[PDB]
Structures are given as C-alpha cells and as structure tokens.
Write an enzyme that holds these catalytic residues in place. Structure first.
Site, PDB file in Angstrom:
ATOM      1  N   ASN A  15      61.669  20.107 -71.956  1.00  0.00           N
ATOM      2  CA  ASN A  15      62.426  20.174 -70.708  1.00  0.00           C
ATOM      3  C   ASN A  15      62.260  21.567 -70.106  1.00  0.00           C
ATOM      4  O   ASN A  15      62.357  22.575 -70.814  1.00  0.00           O
ATOM      5  CB  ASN A  15      63.900  19.826 -70.949  1.00  0.00           C
ATOM      6  CG  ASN A  15      64.775  19.985 -69.705  1.00  0.00           C
ATOM      7  OD1 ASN A  15      64.974  21.092 -69.199  1.00  0.00           O
ATOM      8  ND2 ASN A  15      65.344  18.880 -69.241  1.00  0.00           N
TER       9      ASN A  15
ATOM     10  N   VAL B 255      63.463  15.283 -67.531  1.00  0.00           N
ATOM     11  CA  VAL B 255      64.416  15.942 -66.653  1.00  0.00           C
ATOM     12  C   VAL B 255      65.790  15.372 -66.987  1.00  0.00           C
ATOM     13  O   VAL B 255      65.941  14.160 -67.130  1.00  0.00           O
ATOM     14  CB  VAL B 255      64.052  15.714 -65.167  1.00  0.00           C
ATOM     15  CG1 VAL B 255      65.031  16.442 -64.243  1.00  0.00           C
ATOM     16  CG2 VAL B 255      62.619  16.180 -64.896  1.00  0.00           C
ATOM     17  N   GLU B 256      66.785  16.243 -67.125  1.00  0.00           N
ATOM     18  CA  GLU B 256      68.108  15.839 -67.618  1.00  0.00           C
ATOM     19  C   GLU B 256      68.782  14.754 -66.755  1.00  0.00           C
ATOM     20  O   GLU B 256      69.598  13.968 -67.256  1.00  0.00           O
ATOM     21  CB  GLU B 256      69.018  17.071 -67.807  1.00  0.00           C
ATOM     22  CG  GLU B 256      69.377  17.806 -66.523  1.00  0.00           C
ATOM     23  CD  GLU B 256      68.357  18.847 -66.098  1.00  0.00           C
ATOM     24  OE1 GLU B 256      67.204  18.860 -66.606  1.00  0.00           O
ATOM     25  OE2 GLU B 256      68.720  19.659 -65.225  1.00  0.00           O
ATOM     26  N   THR B 257      68.415  14.690 -65.474  1.00  0.00           N
ATOM     27  CA  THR B 257      68.977  13.682 -64.572  1.00  0.00           C
ATOM     28  C   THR B 257      68.315  12.312 -64.709  1.00  0.00           C
ATOM     29  O   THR B 257      68.755  11.347 -64.068  1.00  0.00           O
ATOM     30  CB  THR B 257      68.886  14.140 -63.120  1.00  0.00           C
ATOM     31  OG1 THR B 257      67.545  14.573 -62.855  1.00  0.00           O
ATOM     32  CG2 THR B 257      69.745  15.382 -62.880  1.00  0.00           C
ATOM     33  N   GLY B 258      67.257  12.219 -65.522  1.00  0.00           N
ATOM     34  CA  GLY B 258      66.691  10.910 -65.828  1.00  0.00           C
ATOM     35  C   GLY B 258      65.188  10.679 -65.804  1.00  0.00           C
ATOM     36  O   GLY B 258      64.700   9.890 -66.608  1.00  0.00           O
TER      37      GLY B 258
END
Lengths: 515, 515, 515
Positions: C297, C323-326
């Site tokens: 990431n 990416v942490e949002t998906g």
C-alpha cells in the site's frame, strides 16, 4: 396456415407439432454448418420421423446454404428417405452424404451454387429481387457454358445465365425463396426476439428468416430457453420477433454435436489462457506465402494446421485468418476460441467476392495441365463446393496445398531429406479434368498469383502452364515427380531445392516478409 | 508449507495433490450451503479418500459456518470417519448428520454458535480481533448460564462469556481462525482473481479466505475454469488472487447437487417469464401476518410455501422476502430465480441482528409453557440452529409455524371445516424444554410480537404465557386442544374462530394491510 | 417523519426538499472519499444552503468515515458554519479543513478513530453491537492512556477504553449509529435497488445505509438516473431498495469533482492501452523494499509515484498495490484505471488489520528518538490519521518516506550525487513528539521491520533506537545529517552509500527479489 399469436406471444409447440405445418411440395431452408453448428436438430428429427411414420409430407425442395452434418447419418441425411425430397440446392454436398447419394443416383434434381452466392440469392429473395449478378463461377462447372451448376443428368432447368455489363462477363443466378425455415438461436423473449449468446456463430439466420417471411412462409425457430418480453439487450437481438412464426424449446440444445455442456470460451465470453510429419511440412511451406498484415483463409485439408505452425514460429499475431461462415481470428485450444469478431456469413462472402483476401489456402483433389483444379466431385461422389469457388475466384494469392499422388502416400522426413516410404497409387496431376471447380485461365486473366504446394515439389501457374519452381531434397526429378504426373510441366530456370529449414525438426526462425 | 507461485501464477493442482498439504490437527473451514450450493466437492471427496486410504491426516478441527449436504451422506458427512475429526464448530448441524452422530455420542468436541455470529467471528479473525460482542443468543442454550453453546457432555471449554456494556447484557464469542480453507468460485484468472457469475450466491467466501490467509494458512479454491490474467471485470471479482494458495479446476462443477447443466436463470443473467392441504392452511394463516412494504424471512418447513400462496392471492410484489445466505427476493419456478439482489452472507446477518426484519416465519419442533421454542435438538438428534437464533432474536414480529401434535397426524379440510381424521401420537406443546433455542422471556423484554400458528389453533405470547386467540372450525376446545397440550394456556376473552376463508378451496380475496 | 412510499416506489425529492427531513441534533453520516469520489454533493450543498438561509437545523453531529473534499472549501467544509455542527467523528480530518478549523479552535467536540476501525464500528452499529475490540491504536494518541482519540481540550467524554483478552491489551471502541445518511450510487430502480457501475469505488455505502436504517433513521441517496423496477442485474445491485428512504436524482452527477463526463475506463468497463528529482529519488529507494509477489500500500506523499517508477523499471506486474478505500491494482494514465478488483472498504480494512500487507509506504511529518511518527497533528493543525494507523499497526514492513528537513528545502541530483542547494529550515527528526500516530515500541513488540527513507539518509528502527544504515553520495555525515537532527542515531557498522544507480538519470536495471 400458421398458428395464431395470442396477445402478441409467439406460438410455442413441440417439434412434432411444428412440422405438421409443412405441406407437400414445400421449399424448406435449413440453417446450420458442420458438426451441429446452429442446427435445429429437433426439427430435422421430427420431420424425418413424421415421414418415416406417415410417408408425408412429400416432394419437398431443400435449400441448404452451408453443409450440415458429420459426413455420415447426421445433418440432413435423415431427410434422404425416398419420396420426401425431390429437389435440392446446396452450397456444400459432402457434409450430408445420404442426400448426395440420392443426387448421384439421379433420384433428385440437384444444384450447387457457390455457397457465398447461394446466401446472397436468399438475401435477394428477401427483397424480392429476381436474382444476382456475379462473376463468381465464370469458367467453372457453375458457368452455363459448362454444367450450369447441375450435378446430375436428370437436372435440366437452367438457373444460371450469362450476362454482360461494362464490357465484362457475369453470371446471373436466379433467386429462389423458401416456404419453410428451420432456424435456431440461443434464447428468445415471449414475442420471438432472439439472441445468439451461446451459439458458435451467426451464419445467415436473419437472411433465411426474412426470405421465408416475405414469401408468405412459416419460420420455425429452435431455442434453448425463453425469457420475459423485452428483457434482452436490444443490441444483442439478431432476429426480430415478428419474423418468427413458431418456436420450439429444446432445453438440452448443445453448441455442437456430442452433448457437451455450454463452453463459454466458445460463446466468446471469456479469454482462454508438433511432430515433423507430411502435414507439418506442407503447412510450413504454406506459411512462406504469408506476409505481415495479410488477411487469409485456410480451408480444411493438409494445410489446416498452419495456425499452429505460425504459433510455433512466433508470428501468429502478425496476420489474421478469417472463416467464410463468419468468425474472424481465434485459436484452436470443434470450434475456435479467443475470436476477434463474428460477422454474419453473407457479409463475409461480400468481402471475399470483392477480393478481400490477400491469401487463401485450399486443398485440391486433381490438377490438370491448364492449372484447373477439381474439388466438387471425387471418385463418383458429389462433394460440392462449400466456399471453394467464392474464395478461389478473386483472392490475390491462391495457394493450393496437397500431395503429389493420392492413395496412401507415406513419406518420412529424416536427415534433412524427404523419403518416399510408400508411393501413392493414383496420379493427382492429370491431363484434363472431367469437370472444373477452379479455372486456371480465368485466374490468369484476373491477375491472380497461383501456387501448388506438395510435399515433394512446388509449382506456379504461368501463361504457358505449370512451372516447377522447387523440389524437396532427397527427391529425384524424373522418377519422383515427372513420372508421377500425366503432363510435362515447364521446369523453371530458377529451379531450387525447397528451403533446408523446412525439413529440420527444430524452430525455423522464420520471419514473415514486411507488409 | 505451500506450493510456490511461478511467475505470479497461482499453483493449479489435482484435489488429491492439494489435500496432501493438510497437516495433522489443522483447523479446516468449509464453504457451502445445503444441496451443493458453493460446495468444493472435489476437495471434500479427496480428503475423505486420503483418510480412507492412509488414516491421515489426524485430529482435524472443522468450522462450518452454514450446513453443507443433503441431510444424509453428502456435504461433510464423508469426513465423519473415526479419528479424522476431533472438534467441530458449526452453524447448522442437521445437514451433515454423520458428523452430528459423532457429537451425539460424545466422540467429538462440539459447539453451535448462531450461524450469523459464527460468520461474524470469522470476519473478526481476519482482522485479528479476539472476538465479538453481541446480545444474539442471550437466554438460549448459547448463553453461558445455560449450555454456552456446547452440544454434548464431553465438551467443556468455554468459548462464550457473559459481559456487560452500557448497563446491558451481552455475550462475548471467541473468534477462532482456520488454518485451511476449502472455497469455491465459478471462474478465476491465472493469478487467482475469482468471479461468481454462475454460483447461486456468495455466502462468506471472501471472509473465509481472509481469515485463513491472515492466520498464515492455506486457501484452496475449486473453480469450473480458468482464464487469461486480468481479463475479468474488476467489479465482478469477489476474491483477489493474492488470497488464494492452490486452485483446483473441476470442469464439471455444477451449481447444485444432481449434475444438472448451468441454469442461467439461477445465475441471475436472464428473467424467467395448489391443493388445500395442511401446509397450505398454515401458510395462508401466516400470510395474515404480512404487511404492505414488510421485509421478511421464511425458514424451511410447514409454511415455506408462503411465497406461492401470496402469488395466488396477488400480493407477492407488496412485500420482500430475504434469505439469510444472501439472496433478496425472487420466485420459485433447486434455487430461486428473478432475484432482486444478492448480498454476502455476513452483511445479511448484520442487517438481521439490528432488527431489520419486520417479520419472520420459522418452524418449531417443540414449544413450552413459557413460550420457549426448541429446534436445535429433537428426539436426541442434533439439528443445530442455522440462522434460527439470528432471526428470532430481534425481528419485530416472530411467527412460529407447525402442528399441535406429530407422528401420523392426518387432517382433511371439508366444507370450510377442519376434521382431524387421525391424531398425532406426540404432543409438541410441552411443560418444559430441556434446551432452549428461543426465549419467550427475552422476546417480551425486547418488545417483540410472538405468534404460534398451528392447523387447529393460534396463540400469542404475553407476560402470563401463551394465550389461545383462535380456534379452527370443526375442532373442540377441550378434547382437540387443551387435552392435546401438556400445559394450560390462557384462553383469550376475545377468542374467535379462525377465518373461514382459510378452509375454502378457492382464492381468499385477502388484501395486505399497511401499518 | 419520512415520506411514505407509494405502491412500493421510493419517494423522489429535490435535494432542498430532502434536507428538510433533518431534525435538530441529528447524527449525520456522510459517504465519500477525496476529490468527489462517491459524494452526494447536492445533499451537502442543500444542507449548507438551508442553514445559511434559516439557521436550521442546529447542533448536528457528523460522522465522516473517510475524508471528503479538496483540502480546502469543498467536501464537508460547507457545513462548518457556526451552530450547524457541534460534534464530529472523522477518520481523516485534513480533507475538509474548515471543520478541522472548528476543532482547532474548540468550537466543536472532535474525535478521530482510525479510519478502518471507524467503518468497523458503523458495521457493528448496524448489527446493534455496542462496540468492537481491536489492538489497532494501542500506544498511539487513540489509546486512552494518551489522548483517547480526543483532538482538542473541549472534548471530554471517553469513547475508547482499555480491555484485556487472552493476556493481551486491546481497545474497546464504542459503536455510534447515525440518524441520517447521505449516500450515493450511479443508478437505482423505482424501488431504490442501486448499482455502482460508473462510480470510482464502493467505499462503505451499504454499511452506512444498514447502520442508519436499523437505528430508525433516514437514508437519503443521490443517483445519476432511475430505471424500471427489477431491470438491473441482481449481482450488480449493492444496496437493496428497502434500505433507502429518499432518492434525489442528479442527472449532472460526475464521477469526480470538476464536471468531466463519465470515463468508462474509470468505471472499469474497458482496458486502457520521469525527471530525476527529489520525489523520484525517494520512490526509487522505496522500490528496493518491494519483493516479487508482495501485496503493498502506498500513501499520499513523496513516495506516491512508486507505481510509475516500477513501470519504468519493468517490474510493475510483479507485485500488487492495494488502496484502503477498496481498489486493487491499476495504473495512473484523478483515479486509477485497469484495476484488478474493487472490494468494499470495511473488508479491505479487515485484511489490513490482520497483517495482510507485506509492505506499506507512508509519509511522515515528524519522527522522534524512539522511532515514533507524528502525522495527525502538525504545527497546531489537525490532519487526522486517515488509514495511517490501520496500515502502520500490523503491516510486516513499514517504510516511512519523507525529507530529513523541511521549509523550502532545495535539492538537485547531478553528477551521480545529491547536492543540497538550500537546506530546510525546520528539523523533522526531533527529541520527543507532542502526540504519537505510530509507536516505535509497539512495532518492535509486534516484530515489524521499520525503515525511514529520506533523500540523504536511510534509517532502520532497532531496540536501541534509529540506526543510520545508508548515506547519499555528496552529503557530509556530520553537517548534513547529524547536525540536522535533534537526537543521535546509532551509526551502523555496515554503513554504506545509497546505491549509485539511484542518482543516475537512466534506467536502473533494477530486479525485484523473488517471492
């Protein structure tokens, strides 16, 4: 007489009930290609059963744009019960040989239009045009100055005539409209609107439906399933519902013969992730005729593994092969996958007829001293053309591929050489064809480049005849070539050994010539 | 010890090769629901076969979020071989009865978390959270004050504890991470990225893969086919390839048990276009509890035909039925078609736990004087809960459906009247449940409306016990109800006869009320 | 007070009409990420406008899982009018700095849960769970032994407490349920069933809807268009209609800020076919920390061009960035294209929390002698964490990237050397942080590999503090490094020059180490 639609819904019947609507003397058009492709099998089965049981209906006329079947008892072979069929016009005859048998024995009237012309005449029939003007077929058995496409002695009526436009000769082919259609799709809605999502290709299903509809006929469509009205994507609908009169649902419908489940690679929905024998030899030499950027077509025969050889040489992506029935591109992992496009068959032939192909590769049964090629009749049997005339008529380079002799020729490639282990017992290069499928004289007039590739020799057609341009290493000119032909070819002043790399059991390092 | 990836490609092995990577005492998590849904059958078969042949591996622990199998010898029943399994935690035990038999005989350690809580704990395990806090299960056998979810006498270790937050009671359920996963998808690319296009649903496949992956385990995935890297639609991919350790390709993978070909209505890709018996009677009365706009759930059993009854009455589109495994809406034409949405199972249970259901319809095995319902054990057999606790814990209206007696209960409807032709030999309304699946006391404390519907009587739960509110015409209060229960119900002053329309073999003219 | 549905159709209102249903003191949850991603902009606008005109509604509480806006006046900055908001809990505070300004000035109550934990608590609230137990945040400002996630002096109430399970420390985070949601989708049917086909990603829209719905709240959804009931593919529906109370249609809705038309590469429907400066230098050195088959990431900042560097070196397909949002994978041709998958955000954080990341790259504001890092507050300004704590808590290798000094630092890479043209005026490596976003002590306890990469120096965290392991060519140890830090690092006995290739303006010939 057709079953009425109730509240707009297309009549759904069993195949047995559907075929009860076919009268005596009906002209039946049957959709489909080889090995079960797009074949309304339950309708063919139902018709054959009705005749077997009741001896009705009688004296049908059949039109088959493409050849259906497995070269045996499938396809329309079941319709070859005496009295059922009286008249047939087919683009390819060899695929259903029981119908061919009736023609051979003068029991039915029998015609062979070139397959591409045939489908164009059905499209003409849809528009009520009386016929089509094409120079496809000039100088061959389809030419009225030869056999007029008539396959036996009992066939008499002229369907083809010579016409002239712009100081050029053309053939006029009469357009015949069918009364009944057996078509197929994957799915339709309650009103008949049909999609082809699981089918191998499209062929000429729409054209057939239009031709029958506009002739006051009955269109019968086999599907795998039906769905709610207006739930199919409009850009995926290939046949509008108002063209369909009867639907038969076959939930077990398969893409091909053999009862395999639906393969979604074959559907086009997903992307899929060689011994040096006589076949690989000819395929390798055939590959030498390809250029970067070329659009090609490969027919069934000794050279039909050219795609796999191209893959081995690392140049498969440098050119594109098309198939006359509609698929463009693809690989062999009885259908290709990873295709690049699928066109309807009539549009594909339009392209071929105007000289769209840079190169074609075709098998031959016999070649004569004029460079003529015979393919449509073999040892008494009626094989028909398929797309042979449509392809060999105007393609820029015509590459005939076969062996020099027939009848169990056995050859071995050892120590960089060709060795004839067992000679064929029949000559293929003969003095004069009994009937012509390809005219050497016409090809020369059209400025086409004609090659004949065999395992032991390569020829080119010129104004003075066949020139021998290449010989295999290990082969003697006089005993192995000249003594095995029934005419004398011109020996090229540039006569050379066939390329050494062809006979070595390793990658050739072959580079395709630039565009 | 896992097979290495070569150039980023996920290792593809036979199921036999794959199961060799399972060590002794591994914790195995198996994906799947009843009747073959999302079941990695080749891996289960391969493991059972390895043990049958070699008596390895030994002393496995099993986690089974949902119940796999056919209530017989399929599912995970083949894993019930002596010494293969020593510990099991399952959400539904009755679907694989050979494993339940081991539990009943104190041969394995055996737990039952509510199915929804169970999948939530696996999600917690993925994130390395030690467990989850929920009031689902308070007052039931899952509560530590009762049996703490332990299914037999040999099971001793507490996994669940009673805790307090914001002056309220909750249960803390320990999260347990698996070492090995058997999961399944339709399709994956060469790097393991997987889509579910032909699967009936999703269940908790991603959750299971993440839990195993973050526990240093081995994720094994069965698929029908594999495709070229990066050719699948990114919004269709449900499992990223880096979570997958081994892939097993089963070309003949079917949507459900029974080997039927892919049904594309079941896939969700196309839109598809009743005797008055005991089951129909109960379903009809259950429909009276439905309101316009209600979100509901219907469990397997006597009233599971309620969807079809609503269709008959013309009110099917006035409410929505959800299924705990993910599907929302749909019709029965082995699975539903024309669904409206498919959620992952864990998200569906989140919804249920917070009181999302307006109404639920559940079968009962026994009912006691306190309104407690027993379902997870009956006649000494372990059935487990399935989603029963997740649904009956917080849904606004709880409708229990069944018969007053069982064992050859024969009933007939005549002239809008009930006639008991042969009485059941066992009473289902008893003094005291041995083990509780649903607490009457807790439901009242939560302000929930509780109904019990039988063929001959309807009850409601109140602070002083079950109130009899309706009697079937043709039934005597004293000898057909009171004498057939092992406890004394309150007889409602507003006691009336069950609606006569329920007993007439024609459309009721029922309209859904709107609150 | 909700508008009633007519015959099952979801009420459709203007944004102005919709926001009138928000009462005083409501808890409002706003969906969205940076730069317009999934933001119901018309709803935010209408609320800000209602307040500007009427000074109602009053004293709202805001929950913002992800940071909305453009780091200026967009996002929820319009809601920062005095008296509109009294309380806020956000995952990332710097994206809407007008609300951060209110927090800095003690005008609102202000909390920061780690972004991942925040979305998990909303999912807990949907299920009526009181809170979640997680060790994410231990030893940082979120720990109640430090600031308890409280961002200013006026914030007093404890939402986070320290607990113990299995002799390990955990934090208990209270779950708070919202009263109103502003969510967004591409399309919905007449009943509110919604798809996300043109949206950049999914974030946590379903979780937010469920949380509000189960709290008796009002879910308001903005969409681009509405379609006929039950015509969307059920496997594409992400939000079931019964969760939506009000729909607002915005035909002008764009994927991102700026009003550009829909980009179908961004939608995921199609496959799309560097100066040696300070940023490239740090990204090149960061790339050395990657391994074939790693899942990584990359955070916003100096190293966020590492994708382009990998592409220049030809190793981009050898690892995967999430990416942490998906979104998983993809390339930069305001959003990425050619992604491999999109997960929902909460699921992505479950994966990160369990140590799923092999490597992460994060920017730093300040670093202290114990290896602690500060990012959430700098120079009095509230930046918040975003996913910083979720990622830096358990990822196997943590790579902090930044400069040694800041404040108009000017540097140039010339002659294969680093030349400090103008030194930064402010030291970033200081004795003690005022508040901690990442604990060096906890990282070492968890067995993590921690690197600090600057343009001139590379460090590794060890038990005895920061070890200097690499120096840039062209830099003096004493005056350019040791003199510019406020503490003394251990100088590694294996101290070496930073790789020569980093400082040469040509392809490095870098090869990724095997898996």
């Amino acid at each position: 007489v057709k079953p009425p639609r109730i509240n707009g819904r297309v009549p759904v019947l069993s195949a047995q009930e559907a075929v009860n609507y076919i009268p005596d003397e009906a002209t039946l058009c049957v959709l489909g290609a080889g090995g079960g492709i797009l074949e309304a099998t339950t309708l063919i089965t139902a018709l054959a059963d009705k005749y077997k049981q009741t001896q009705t209906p009688r004296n049908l006329s059949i039109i088959s744009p493409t050849g259906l079947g497995d070269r045996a008892d499938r396809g329309i072979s079941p319709l070859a019960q005496e009295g059922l069929v009286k008249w047939a016009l087919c683009g390819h005859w060899g695929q259903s040989p029981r119908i061919s048998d009736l023609a051979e024995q003068n029991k039915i009237i029998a015609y062979n239009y070139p397959q591409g012309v045939l489908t164009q005449t059905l499209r003409a029939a849809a528009a009520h045009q009386p016929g089509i003007i094409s120079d496809i077929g000039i100088g061959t058995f389809v030419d009225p100055r030869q056999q007029g496409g008539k396959l036996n002695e009992v066939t008499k009526e002229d369907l083809i005539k010579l016409v002239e436009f712009d100081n050029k000769e053309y053939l006029y082919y009469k357009a015949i409209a069918p009364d009944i259609a057996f078509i197929r799709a994957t799915t339709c809605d309650s009103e008949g609107y049909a999609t082809f999502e699981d089918e191998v290709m499209y062929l000429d299903a729409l054209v057939i439906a239009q031709a029958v509809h506009n002739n006051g006929g009955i269109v019968m469509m086999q599907v795998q399933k039906m769905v709610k009205k207006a739930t199919l994507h409009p850009k995926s609908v290939r046949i509008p519902g108002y063209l369909v009169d009867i639907v038969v649902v076959d939930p077990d419908q398969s893409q091909l013969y053999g009862g395999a489940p639906v393969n979604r690679f074959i559907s086009g929905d997903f992307t899929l992730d060689l011994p040096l024998n006589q076949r690989k030899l000819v395929a390798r030499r055939a590959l030498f005729e390809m250029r970067k950027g070329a659009v090609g077509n490969v027919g069934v025969g000794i050279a039909d593994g050219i795609g796999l050889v191209a893959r081995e040489e690392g140049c498969a992506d440098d050119f594109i092969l098309t198939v006359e029935t509609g698929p463009i591109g693809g690989i062999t992992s009885g259908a290709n996958v990873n295709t690049r496009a699928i066109l309807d068959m009539t549009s594909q032939f339009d392209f071929y007829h105007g000289g769209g192909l840079d190169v074609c590769y075709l098998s031959f049964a016999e070649v004569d001293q004029h460079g003529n090629v015979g393919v449509h009749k073999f040892n008494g049997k009626i094989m028909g053309t398929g797309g042979f005339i449509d392809i060999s008529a105007t393609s820029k380079k015509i590459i005939f591929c076969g062996t020099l002799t027939a009848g169990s020729l056995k050859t071995e490639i050892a120590d960089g050489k060709l060795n004839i282990v067992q000679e064929g017992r029949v000559k293929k290069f003969i003095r004069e064809l009994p009937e012509i499928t390809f005219s050497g004289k016409i090809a020369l007039e059209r400025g086409l480049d004609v090659r004949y590739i065999t395992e032991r020799a390569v020829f080119t057609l010129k104004e003075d005849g066949l020139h021998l341009i290449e010989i295999a290493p290990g082969v003697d000119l006089q005993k192995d070539i000249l003594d095995k032909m029934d005419f004398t070819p011109v020996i090229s002043p540039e006569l050379k050994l066939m390329d050494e790399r062809l006979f070595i059991d390793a990658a050739m390092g072959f580079v395709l010539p630039e565009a």
